[PDB]
Design a protein around this ligand. Structure first.
Ligand SMILES: [Cu+2]
Ligand SMILES: [Cu+2]
Lengths: 118, 114
């Protein structure tokens, strides 16, 4: 592929609304997307207050790093709190979801293999 | 599902002829990762990762401080809230010219090891 290095403020990317049957109150910035990624993509998710990614699973793994705020992680059995400075590894096919139970925005990085899109 | 405070992962000190004043935490390593690994680097004041290149890409997010990025020629300083995409084979390195620790997340395909 091409040469070089991209160096960019993540907030230069506009946060786009995600609205699906299972997601509400979430925006996403694609940082390193399909147009560039040899293997895996980097997105920055913003969960608005009360925002919800309902429990689901995917056939690929996810790697998450929490940048800002206090995030409720939905698990097959129950839920757990994480905050800025936590990482999360979601195995392929593992049930997971997220909710923001606070009154300020939560931000997290989420990376998936590029076969799962951006 | 693994949920952990990154700080609680024990950092590995690196001090070699090419890397000094750097600590590395393997957050998501080879034992867990099907495809790519997640590391968190801390660069002490004056710390250096000298110029090098790899056959794989790197995806970085700057978490704390002002990171000086070495390029094939010259350098560029960025700060917390920047992401960096290093193409495969691109010469790169890092330095911390500030008086406080700099931290960045770095992910590579698992062929790059942990
Ligand atoms: Cu998911
Ligand atoms: Cu490197």
């Amino acid at each position: 592929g091409p040469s070089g290095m991209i160096l960019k403020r993540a907030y230069d990317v506009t946060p786009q609304k995600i609205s699906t049957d299972k997601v509400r109150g979430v925006r996403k910035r694609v940082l390193i997307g399909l147009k560039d990624a040899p293997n895996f993509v980097m997105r920055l998710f913003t969960v608005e207050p009360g925002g919800l990614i309902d429990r689901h699973s995917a056939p690929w793994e996810a790697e998450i790093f929490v940048l800002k705020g206090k995030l409720t992680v939905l698990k097959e059995q129950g839920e757990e709190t994480v905050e800025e400075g936590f990482y999360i590894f979601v195995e392929p096919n593992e049930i997971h979801g997220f909710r923001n139970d606070t009154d300020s925005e939560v931000e997290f990085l989420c990376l998936i293999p590029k076969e799962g899109g951006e």
